[PDB]
Scaffold this active site. Structure first.
Site, short mmCIF file in Angstrom:
data_model
loop_
_atom_site.label_atom_id
_atom_site.label_comp_id
_atom_site.label_asym_id
_atom_site.label_seq_id
_atom_site.Cartn_x
_atom_site.Cartn_y
_atom_site.Cartn_z
N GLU A 35 0.85 -1.18 0.00
CA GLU A 35 0.00 0.00 0.00
C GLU A 35 0.90 1.25 0.00
OE1 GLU A 35 -3.02 0.36 -0.67
OE2 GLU A 35 -3.93 -1.67 -0.42
N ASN A 46 -7.29 8.70 -6.03
CA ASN A 46 -8.17 7.87 -6.86
C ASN A 46 -8.99 8.82 -7.74
OD1 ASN A 46 -8.71 6.84 -3.60
ND2 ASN A 46 -7.25 5.73 -4.87
N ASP A 48 -12.27 9.10 -8.23
CA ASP A 48 -13.61 9.50 -7.70
C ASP A 48 -13.40 10.70 -6.75
OD1 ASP A 48 -12.48 8.38 -5.58
OD2 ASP A 48 -13.57 6.50 -5.67
N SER A 50 -11.70 10.94 -4.31
CA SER A 50 -11.16 10.50 -3.02
C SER A 50 -9.64 10.38 -3.07
CB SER A 50 -11.84 9.23 -2.57
OG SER A 50 -11.36 8.10 -3.26
N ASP A 52 -6.30 8.17 -0.90
CA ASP A 52 -5.87 7.16 0.07
C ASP A 52 -4.70 7.75 0.87
OD1 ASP A 52 -7.69 5.33 -0.99
OD2 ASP A 52 -6.18 4.25 -2.08
N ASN A 59 -9.12 5.39 2.85
CA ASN A 59 -9.85 6.19 1.79
C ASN A 59 -10.74 7.25 2.44
OD1 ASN A 59 -12.31 6.46 -0.23
ND2 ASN A 59 -10.32 6.34 -1.24
N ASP A 101 -15.78 -4.50 8.23
CA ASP A 101 -16.89 -3.90 7.45
C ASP A 101 -17.47 -4.83 6.39
OD1 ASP A 101 -18.58 -1.66 7.28
OD2 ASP A 101 -17.53 -0.99 5.51
#
EC number: 3.2.1.17
Length: 129
Positions: A35, A46, A48, A50, A52, A59, A101
């Site tokens: 990562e 990213n 969209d 967003s 990270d 995110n 989640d």
């Protein structure tokens, strides 16, 4: 801060990630390696809108507030800047929510792509834990 491999493994173990939700420490060390390359200041956009953030590339659409992500929710109730700290405590505590989640560690694309189903024990080789 760039962590050494076993430095990170020791911090993650102190914060309870070893075997958390059935995922050994080597899974979490592997995830952070791909990562963020163990770089606590890693940031990647990213598409969209967003971003990270940090050692586990958490995110901004659902988990933290960066103040620039449309439709954001902040479920870990922190600025995303708190995930770029040299100490991993914020990241770990948010990660524990994410892995709970409904998808396990499949929330981390680099973990799925490069760690899932592999010999993840190798990531704690030489660490005195």
């Amino acid at each position: 801060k760039v962590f050494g491999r076993c430095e990170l493994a020791a911090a993650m173990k102190r914060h309870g990630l070893d075997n958390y939700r059935g995922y050994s420490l080597g899974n979490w060390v592997c995830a952070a390696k791909f990562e963020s390359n163990f770089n606590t200041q890693a940031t990647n956009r990213n598409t969209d809108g967003s971003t990270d953030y940090g050692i586990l590339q958490i995110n901004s659409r659902w988990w933290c507030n960066d103040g620039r992500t449309p439709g954001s929710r902040n479920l870990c109730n922190i600025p995303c800047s708190a995930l770029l700290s040299s100490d991993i405590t914020a990241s770990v505590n948010c990660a524990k929510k994410i892995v709970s989640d409904g998808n396990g560690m499949n929330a981390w694309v680099a973990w799925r792509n490069r760690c899932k189903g592999t010999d993840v024990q190798a990531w704690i080789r030489g660490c005195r834990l």
